[PDB]
Amino acid sequence: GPLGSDHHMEFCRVCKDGGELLCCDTCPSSYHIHCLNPPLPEIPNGEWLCPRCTCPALKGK
Ligand SMILES: [Zn+2]
Ligand SMILES: [Zn+2]
């Protein structure tokens, strides 16, 4: 809506696509299921933390 496109990144940091944006519940990692290192076969139905929150690193990437 007005003054509110979405939260975090309005597009994919990787592919620049802002459709099925898979963003971390914490970090502004608005990605996709194939716009990360570990590819997901489907979109997580709920809350999903970025592919960096899965480990104590990848934050300075
Ligand atoms: Zn993408
Ligand atoms: Zn995260």
PDB file of N, CA and C and ligand atoms in Angstrom:
ATOM      1  N   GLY A   1       0.833  -1.225   0.000  1.00  0.00           N
ATOM      2  CA  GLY A   1       0.000   0.000   0.000  1.00  0.00           C
ATOM      3  C   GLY A   1       0.850   1.251   0.000  1.00  0.00           C
ATOM      4  N   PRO A   2       0.233   2.438   0.081  1.00  0.00           N
ATOM      5  CA  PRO A   2       0.965   3.704   0.113  1.00  0.00           C
ATOM      6  C   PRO A   2       1.854   3.815   1.349  1.00  0.00           C
ATOM      7  N   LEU A   3       3.084   4.283   1.143  1.00  0.00           N
ATOM      8  CA  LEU A   3       4.074   4.415   2.216  1.00  0.00           C
ATOM      9  C   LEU A   3       4.414   3.058   2.825  1.00  0.00           C
ATOM     10  N   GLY A   4       4.204   1.998   2.063  1.00  0.00           N
ATOM     11  CA  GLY A   4       4.450   0.670   2.571  1.00  0.00           C
ATOM     12  C   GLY A   4       4.429  -0.378   1.484  1.00  0.00           C
ATOM     13  N   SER A   5       5.534  -0.494   0.763  1.00  0.00           N
ATOM     14  CA  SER A   5       5.663  -1.496  -0.277  1.00  0.00           C
ATOM     15  C   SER A   5       5.756  -2.879   0.358  1.00  0.00           C
ATOM     16  N   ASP A   6       6.701  -3.017   1.279  1.00  0.00           N
ATOM     17  CA  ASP A   6       6.841  -4.222   2.086  1.00  0.00           C
ATOM     18  C   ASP A   6       7.876  -3.981   3.175  1.00  0.00           C
ATOM     19  N   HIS A   7       8.282  -5.030   3.871  1.00  0.00           N
ATOM     20  CA  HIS A   7       9.296  -4.895   4.909  1.00  0.00           C
ATOM     21  C   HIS A   7      10.640  -5.420   4.413  1.00  0.00           C
ATOM     22  N   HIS A   8      11.715  -5.019   5.092  1.00  0.00           N
ATOM     23  CA  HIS A   8      13.073  -5.405   4.717  1.00  0.00           C
ATOM     24  C   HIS A   8      13.418  -4.864   3.328  1.00  0.00           C
ATOM     25  N   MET A   9      13.950  -5.720   2.467  1.00  0.00           N
ATOM     26  CA  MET A   9      14.259  -5.320   1.104  1.00  0.00           C
ATOM     27  C   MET A   9      13.029  -5.465   0.225  1.00  0.00           C
ATOM     28  N   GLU A  10      12.724  -4.428  -0.540  1.00  0.00           N
ATOM     29  CA  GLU A  10      11.547  -4.439  -1.397  1.00  0.00           C
ATOM     30  C   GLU A  10      11.766  -5.349  -2.603  1.00  0.00           C
ATOM     31  N   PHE A  11      13.018  -5.725  -2.832  1.00  0.00           N
ATOM     32  CA  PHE A  11      13.353  -6.664  -3.888  1.00  0.00           C
ATOM     33  C   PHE A  11      14.324  -7.713  -3.372  1.00  0.00           C
ATOM     34  N   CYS A  12      14.618  -8.677  -4.217  1.00  0.00           N
ATOM     35  CA  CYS A  12      15.592  -9.703  -3.910  1.00  0.00           C
ATOM     36  C   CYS A  12      17.000  -9.137  -4.014  1.00  0.00           C
ATOM     37  N   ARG A  13      17.800  -9.329  -2.979  1.00  0.00           N
ATOM     38  CA  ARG A  13      19.180  -8.849  -2.988  1.00  0.00           C
ATOM     39  C   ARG A  13      20.005  -9.591  -4.039  1.00  0.00           C
ATOM     40  N   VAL A  14      19.487 -10.726  -4.483  1.00  0.00           N
ATOM     41  CA  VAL A  14      20.189 -11.563  -5.442  1.00  0.00           C
ATOM     42  C   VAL A  14      19.664 -11.353  -6.860  1.00  0.00           C
ATOM     43  N   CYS A  15      18.391 -11.660  -7.072  1.00  0.00           N
ATOM     44  CA  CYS A  15      17.821 -11.627  -8.411  1.00  0.00           C
ATOM     45  C   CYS A  15      17.023 -10.343  -8.670  1.00  0.00           C
ATOM     46  N   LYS A  16      16.870  -9.518  -7.631  1.00  0.00           N
ATOM     47  CA  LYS A  16      16.162  -8.236  -7.718  1.00  0.00           C
ATOM     48  C   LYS A  16      14.656  -8.417  -7.910  1.00  0.00           C
ATOM     49  N   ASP A  17      14.185  -9.656  -7.870  1.00  0.00           N
ATOM     50  CA  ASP A  17      12.756  -9.926  -8.002  1.00  0.00           C
ATOM     51  C   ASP A  17      12.051  -9.752  -6.664  1.00  0.00           C
ATOM     52  N   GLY A  18      10.927  -9.047  -6.676  1.00  0.00           N
ATOM     53  CA  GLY A  18      10.210  -8.772  -5.447  1.00  0.00           C
ATOM     54  C   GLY A  18       8.873  -9.484  -5.376  1.00  0.00           C
ATOM     55  N   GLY A  19       8.802 -10.668  -5.967  1.00  0.00           N
ATOM     56  CA  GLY A  19       7.570 -11.425  -5.951  1.00  0.00           C
ATOM     57  C   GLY A  19       7.451 -12.292  -4.718  1.00  0.00           C
ATOM     58  N   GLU A  20       7.879 -13.538  -4.840  1.00  0.00           N
ATOM     59  CA  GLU A  20       7.879 -14.476  -3.725  1.00  0.00           C
ATOM     60  C   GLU A  20       9.101 -14.237  -2.845  1.00  0.00           C
ATOM     61  N   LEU A  21       9.127 -13.098  -2.175  1.00  0.00           N
ATOM     62  CA  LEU A  21      10.295 -12.709  -1.405  1.00  0.00           C
ATOM     63  C   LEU A  21      10.374 -13.479  -0.099  1.00  0.00           C
ATOM     64  N   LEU A  22      11.454 -14.225   0.040  1.00  0.00           N
ATOM     65  CA  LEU A  22      11.706 -15.017   1.230  1.00  0.00           C
ATOM     66  C   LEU A  22      12.685 -14.283   2.132  1.00  0.00           C
ATOM     67  N   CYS A  23      12.151 -13.549   3.093  1.00  0.00           N
ATOM     68  CA  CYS A  23      12.971 -12.721   3.959  1.00  0.00           C
ATOM     69  C   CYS A  23      13.120 -13.352   5.336  1.00  0.00           C
ATOM     70  N   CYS A  24      14.302 -13.192   5.932  1.00  0.00           N
ATOM     71  CA  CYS A  24      14.555 -13.694   7.271  1.00  0.00           C
ATOM     72  C   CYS A  24      13.616 -13.020   8.266  1.00  0.00           C
ATOM     73  N   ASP A  25      13.282 -13.732   9.326  1.00  0.00           N
ATOM     74  CA  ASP A  25      12.424 -13.191  10.370  1.00  0.00           C
ATOM     75  C   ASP A  25      13.186 -12.153  11.188  1.00  0.00           C
ATOM     76  N   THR A  26      14.496 -12.113  11.007  1.00  0.00           N
ATOM     77  CA  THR A  26      15.321 -11.158  11.721  1.00  0.00           C
ATOM     78  C   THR A  26      16.055 -10.221  10.767  1.00  0.00           C
ATOM     79  N   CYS A  27      16.817 -10.802   9.856  1.00  0.00           N
ATOM     80  CA  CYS A  27      17.642 -10.029   8.945  1.00  0.00           C
ATOM     81  C   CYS A  27      16.873  -9.639   7.688  1.00  0.00           C
ATOM     82  N   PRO A  28      17.256  -8.518   7.058  1.00  0.00           N
ATOM     83  CA  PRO A  28      16.619  -8.039   5.826  1.00  0.00           C
ATOM     84  C   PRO A  28      17.037  -8.851   4.601  1.00  0.00           C
ATOM     85  N   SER A  29      17.179 -10.154   4.783  1.00  0.00           N
ATOM     86  CA  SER A  29      17.608 -11.039   3.719  1.00  0.00           C
ATOM     87  C   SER A  29      16.430 -11.472   2.854  1.00  0.00           C
ATOM     88  N   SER A  30      15.874 -10.530   2.108  1.00  0.00           N
ATOM     89  CA  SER A  30      14.782 -10.828   1.200  1.00  0.00           C
ATOM     90  C   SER A  30      15.317 -11.544  -0.039  1.00  0.00           C
ATOM     91  N   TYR A  31      15.236 -12.865  -0.014  1.00  0.00           N
ATOM     92  CA  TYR A  31      15.806 -13.689  -1.064  1.00  0.00           C
ATOM     93  C   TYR A  31      14.701 -14.482  -1.787  1.00  0.00           C
ATOM     94  N   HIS A  32      15.047 -15.689  -2.225  1.00  0.00           N
ATOM     95  CA  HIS A  32      14.099 -16.644  -2.800  1.00  0.00           C
ATOM     96  C   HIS A  32      14.480 -18.034  -2.326  1.00  0.00           C
ATOM     97  N   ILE A  33      13.845 -19.066  -2.861  1.00  0.00           N
ATOM     98  CA  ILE A  33      14.229 -20.427  -2.515  1.00  0.00           C
ATOM     99  C   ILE A  33      15.432 -20.874  -3.342  1.00  0.00           C
ATOM    100  N   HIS A  34      15.752 -20.097  -4.372  1.00  0.00           N
ATOM    101  CA  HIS A  34      16.910 -20.385  -5.211  1.00  0.00           C
ATOM    102  C   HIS A  34      17.850 -19.182  -5.293  1.00  0.00           C
ATOM    103  N   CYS A  35      17.662 -18.214  -4.401  1.00  0.00           N
ATOM    104  CA  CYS A  35      18.527 -17.043  -4.363  1.00  0.00           C
ATOM    105  C   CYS A  35      19.374 -17.044  -3.088  1.00  0.00           C
ATOM    106  N   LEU A  36      19.724 -18.241  -2.650  1.00  0.00           N
ATOM    107  CA  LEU A  36      20.613 -18.431  -1.512  1.00  0.00           C
ATOM    108  C   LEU A  36      21.650 -19.493  -1.853  1.00  0.00           C
ATOM    109  N   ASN A  37      22.470 -19.876  -0.878  1.00  0.00           N
ATOM    110  CA  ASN A  37      23.449 -20.940  -1.086  1.00  0.00           C
ATOM    111  C   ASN A  37      22.779 -22.318  -1.008  1.00  0.00           C
ATOM    112  N   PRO A  38      22.060 -22.638   0.092  1.00  0.00           N
ATOM    113  CA  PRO A  38      21.309 -23.884   0.195  1.00  0.00           C
ATOM    114  C   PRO A  38      19.908 -23.743  -0.406  1.00  0.00           C
ATOM    115  N   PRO A  39      19.668 -24.357  -1.573  1.00  0.00           N
ATOM    116  CA  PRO A  39      18.406 -24.211  -2.301  1.00  0.00           C
ATOM    117  C   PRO A  39      17.271 -24.995  -1.660  1.00  0.00           C
ATOM    118  N   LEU A  40      16.138 -24.336  -1.482  1.00  0.00           N
ATOM    119  CA  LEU A  40      14.955 -24.976  -0.925  1.00  0.00           C
ATOM    120  C   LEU A  40      13.990 -25.339  -2.044  1.00  0.00           C
ATOM    121  N   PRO A  41      13.407 -26.542  -1.999  1.00  0.00           N
ATOM    122  CA  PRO A  41      12.516 -27.019  -3.060  1.00  0.00           C
ATOM    123  C   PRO A  41      11.150 -26.337  -3.028  1.00  0.00           C
ATOM    124  N   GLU A  42      10.782 -25.807  -1.870  1.00  0.00           N
ATOM    125  CA  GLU A  42       9.499 -25.132  -1.707  1.00  0.00           C
ATOM    126  C   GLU A  42       9.642 -23.950  -0.759  1.00  0.00           C
ATOM    127  N   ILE A  43       8.640 -23.080  -0.736  1.00  0.00           N
ATOM    128  CA  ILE A  43       8.644 -21.943   0.174  1.00  0.00           C
ATOM    129  C   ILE A  43       8.133 -22.357   1.551  1.00  0.00           C
ATOM    130  N   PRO A  44       8.881 -22.025   2.611  1.00  0.00           N
ATOM    131  CA  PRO A  44       8.494 -22.350   3.985  1.00  0.00           C
ATOM    132  C   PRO A  44       7.210 -21.635   4.386  1.00  0.00           C
ATOM    133  N   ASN A  45       6.189 -22.410   4.727  1.00  0.00           N
ATOM    134  CA  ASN A  45       4.895 -21.849   5.091  1.00  0.00           C
ATOM    135  C   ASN A  45       4.900 -21.378   6.539  1.00  0.00           C
ATOM    136  N   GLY A  46       5.401 -20.176   6.754  1.00  0.00           N
ATOM    137  CA  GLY A  46       5.468 -19.629   8.088  1.00  0.00           C
ATOM    138  C   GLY A  46       6.640 -18.694   8.256  1.00  0.00           C
ATOM    139  N   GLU A  47       7.315 -18.796   9.385  1.00  0.00           N
ATOM    140  CA  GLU A  47       8.488 -17.982   9.635  1.00  0.00           C
ATOM    141  C   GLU A  47       9.749 -18.740   9.262  1.00  0.00           C
ATOM    142  N   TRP A  48      10.630 -18.080   8.533  1.00  0.00           N
ATOM    143  CA  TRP A  48      11.850 -18.699   8.078  1.00  0.00           C
ATOM    144  C   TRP A  48      13.007 -17.726   8.271  1.00  0.00           C
ATOM    145  N   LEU A  49      14.062 -18.186   8.921  1.00  0.00           N
ATOM    146  CA  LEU A  49      15.223 -17.347   9.152  1.00  0.00           C
ATOM    147  C   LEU A  49      16.215 -17.536   8.016  1.00  0.00           C
ATOM    148  N   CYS A  50      16.922 -16.466   7.682  1.00  0.00           N
ATOM    149  CA  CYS A  50      17.810 -16.446   6.530  1.00  0.00           C
ATOM    150  C   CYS A  50      18.811 -17.602   6.559  1.00  0.00           C
ATOM    151  N   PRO A  51      19.415 -17.920   5.400  1.00  0.00           N
ATOM    152  CA  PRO A  51      20.397 -19.004   5.284  1.00  0.00           C
ATOM    153  C   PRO A  51      21.716 -18.681   5.983  1.00  0.00           C
ATOM    154  N   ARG A  52      21.725 -17.607   6.756  1.00  0.00           N
ATOM    155  CA  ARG A  52      22.895 -17.239   7.528  1.00  0.00           C
ATOM    156  C   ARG A  52      22.605 -17.370   9.016  1.00  0.00           C
ATOM    157  N   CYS A  53      21.330 -17.249   9.379  1.00  0.00           N
ATOM    158  CA  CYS A  53      20.901 -17.424  10.758  1.00  0.00           C
ATOM    159  C   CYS A  53      21.028 -18.885  11.179  1.00  0.00           C
ATOM    160  N   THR A  54      21.213 -19.748  10.193  1.00  0.00           N
ATOM    161  CA  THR A  54      21.362 -21.174  10.417  1.00  0.00           C
ATOM    162  C   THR A  54      22.722 -21.506  11.020  1.00  0.00           C
ATOM    163  N   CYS A  55      23.608 -20.521  11.051  1.00  0.00           N
ATOM    164  CA  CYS A  55      24.963 -20.731  11.529  1.00  0.00           C
ATOM    165  C   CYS A  55      25.498 -19.463  12.191  1.00  0.00           C
ATOM    166  N   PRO A  56      26.520 -19.583  13.053  1.00  0.00           N
ATOM    167  CA  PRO A  56      27.119 -18.440  13.748  1.00  0.00           C
ATOM    168  C   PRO A  56      28.086 -17.658  12.856  1.00  0.00           C
ATOM    169  N   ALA A  57      27.674 -17.418  11.616  1.00  0.00           N
ATOM    170  CA  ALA A  57      28.490 -16.696  10.652  1.00  0.00           C
ATOM    171  C   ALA A  57      27.631 -16.203   9.493  1.00  0.00           C
ATOM    172  N   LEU A  58      28.290 -15.831   8.392  1.00  0.00           N
ATOM    173  CA  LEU A  58      27.617 -15.381   7.171  1.00  0.00           C
ATOM    174  C   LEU A  58      26.876 -14.061   7.380  1.00  0.00           C
ATOM    175  N   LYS A  59      27.172 -13.375   8.476  1.00  0.00           N
ATOM    176  CA  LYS A  59      26.550 -12.090   8.751  1.00  0.00           C
ATOM    177  C   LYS A  59      27.349 -10.966   8.114  1.00  0.00           C
ATOM    178  N   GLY A  60      28.656 -11.164   8.010  1.00  0.00           N
ATOM    179  CA  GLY A  60      29.507 -10.189   7.360  1.00  0.00           C
ATOM    180  C   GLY A  60      29.699 -10.498   5.892  1.00  0.00           C
ATOM    181  N   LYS A  61      28.638 -10.961   5.252  1.00  0.00           N
ATOM    182  CA  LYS A  61      28.670 -11.273   3.835  1.00  0.00           C
ATOM    183  C   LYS A  61      27.929 -10.200   3.052  1.00  0.00           C
TER     184      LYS A  61
HETATM  185 ZN    ZN B   1      15.261 -13.886  -5.929  1.00  0.00          ZN
HETATM  186 ZN    ZN B   2      18.754 -13.984   9.617  1.00  0.00          ZN
END
